[PDB]
Amino acid sequence: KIKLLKAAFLQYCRKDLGHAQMVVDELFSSHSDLDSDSELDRAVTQISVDLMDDYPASIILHQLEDKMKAHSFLMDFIHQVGLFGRLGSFPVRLLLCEHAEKLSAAIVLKNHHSRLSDLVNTAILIALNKREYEIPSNLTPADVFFREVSQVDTICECLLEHEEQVLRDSIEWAEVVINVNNILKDMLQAASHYRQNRRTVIIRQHEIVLKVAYPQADSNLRNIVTEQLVALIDCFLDGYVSQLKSVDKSSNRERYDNLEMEYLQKRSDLLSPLLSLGQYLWAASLAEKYCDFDILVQMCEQTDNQSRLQRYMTQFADQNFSDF
Amino acid sequence: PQLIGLYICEENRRANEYDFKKALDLLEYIDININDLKLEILCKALQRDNWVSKDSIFVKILLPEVKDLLQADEFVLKANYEYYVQGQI
């Protein structure tokens, strides 16, 4: 109940000064606790996750940095007092701490980038979710657009499609559709390196692949490459997250695990074809990123005279010969 | 005060990004209610918008300074306050 998650949120406050007293409220917790694994332990998971949601709900950047440290001495004040169990990730809602970490480094990666075009796509993205208090206080806000920033990505995309409907593409309008590509990209670079220090999200990425495909149809050479090294930087983070979820699930209920394979395999084919017009100098890195997707790098070696590449492919491979 | 209030008067017609930016630079020049004005000015920052400038002044600052619910005391105020939680982050 609410009386409990307000008692550990009170023991973490003292868990910054001393421990002894907090270690006896975790000791009173283990004896007074339920201790039936299947849901009462996911009743204290629903508490540790309701306080990670409140250390994320918390000088707007130096104030969001102070909150990635707070949620860092909150993940250390859980490892010690322990806090060595519970997990209610299920569907849509331990991986939930990391995820709320990753999205607080995303909140600081778009705080570090503040210009008039993103701040406008953000104000359009927040006025659409609800109204804002007009007692000044107009960021128009962030502390709740952090716990949910995933949404200011699918909307600062709908504000690049209405800024592309007026783009009239015309050159300065294909420079504004790349500036956003570069931010959603290095906001996905910031969640990757925060995991190294350990269906709307994805749609908005397959939507900007196709809009990064319509533009290189009319673009000065060099520019059409930098947005191609970018949509290659981004596609290599999606294929890496479907690989990591595969490896997460295995065995029984396999039927669902061989149906999600066909789905990622019909997309590394839809990202390959897309790169069939593009430069094949990136194929070598796309073929290595989803380190097999051989059918694509095998038909790039066939379209050219690089019988040297299909010999360099089979030189470093596990059963490609029986595949080629 | 006189300055901040005069830089924001309805008399100052061509008031642009720089007139408010400087009317938020003169707050450390005080020695009464700070955050009442912080609002007074961000609000005429919108009356002049005729729902562009709010946009820019959030582009010029680089944030839990501004208020919110207190503010509305509305479709693109929250809409810009979303790509203002991504900017600050």
Write the DSSP string, A162-222: SSSSSS----TTSSHHHHHHHHHHHTTSTTTTTTT----TTHHHHHHHHHTTTTTTSS-HH
CB-based contact A127 B35, cutoff 8 Å: no
CA distances from A89 to A75, A98, A112 (A): 17, 12, 30
With beta carbons less than 8 A apart as the criterion, state whether B41 and A111 touch: no
CB-based contact A123 B78, cutoff 8 Å: yes
Backbone angles phi, psi at A124, to 5 degrees: -80, -25
Chain A residues whose CB is inside 8 A of the B20 CB are none
CA separation for the pair A303, B2 (Å, rounded): 74
d(CA A51, nearest CA chain B) in Å: 20
Overall size of chain B counted in residues: 89
Residue of chain B nearest A130, judged by CA positions = B78
With beta carbons less than 8 A apart as the criterion, state whether B77 and A127 touch: yes
| Chain CA centroid to CA B48, Å | 11
Chain A interface, mutation test: which of B52, B60, B85, most A Cβ atoms within 10 Å? B85
d(CA B29, nearest CA chain A) in Å: 18
Closest CA to A266 of A232, A239, A233: A239
With beta carbons less than 8 A apart as the criterion, state whether A58 and A103 touch: no
CB-based contact A127 B76, cutoff 8 Å: yes
Residue of chain A nearest B37, judged by CA positions = A136
With a CB-CB cutoff of 8 Å, which residues 44-63 of chain A face chain B?
59-61, 63
Strand partners, B80: A123, A124
CB-based contact B79 A151, cutoff 8 Å: no
d(CA A136, nearest CA chain B) in Å: 4
d(CA B60, nearest CA chain A) in Å: 8
Q: Please, which residues have CB within 8 angstroms of residue A176's CB and are 6 or more apart in sequence? A: A117, A160, A163, A167
In units of Å, what resolution does this entry have? 37.0
The coordinates were experimentally obtained by: cryo-EM
Chain A residues whose CB is inside 8 A of the B55 CB are 116, 119-120, 123
For chain B, say whether A129 makes contact (Cβ under 8 Å). yes
CA separation for the pair B55, A117 (Å, rounded): 8
Closest CA to A152 of A112, A211, A195, A200: A200
Residue of chain A nearest B75, judged by CA positions = A127
Residue of chain B nearest A142, judged by CA positions = B85
CB-based contact A108 B40, cutoff 8 Å: no
With beta carbons less than 8 A apart as the criterion, state whether A142 and A64 touch: yes
Note if the bond before A128 is cis, omega within 30 degrees. no
Q: Please, which residues have CB within 8 angstroms of residue A118's CB and are 6 or more apart in sequence? A: A110, A156, A180, A183, B83, B86, B87
Taking residue A42's Cβ as centre, other Cβ atoms within 10 Å add up to 18
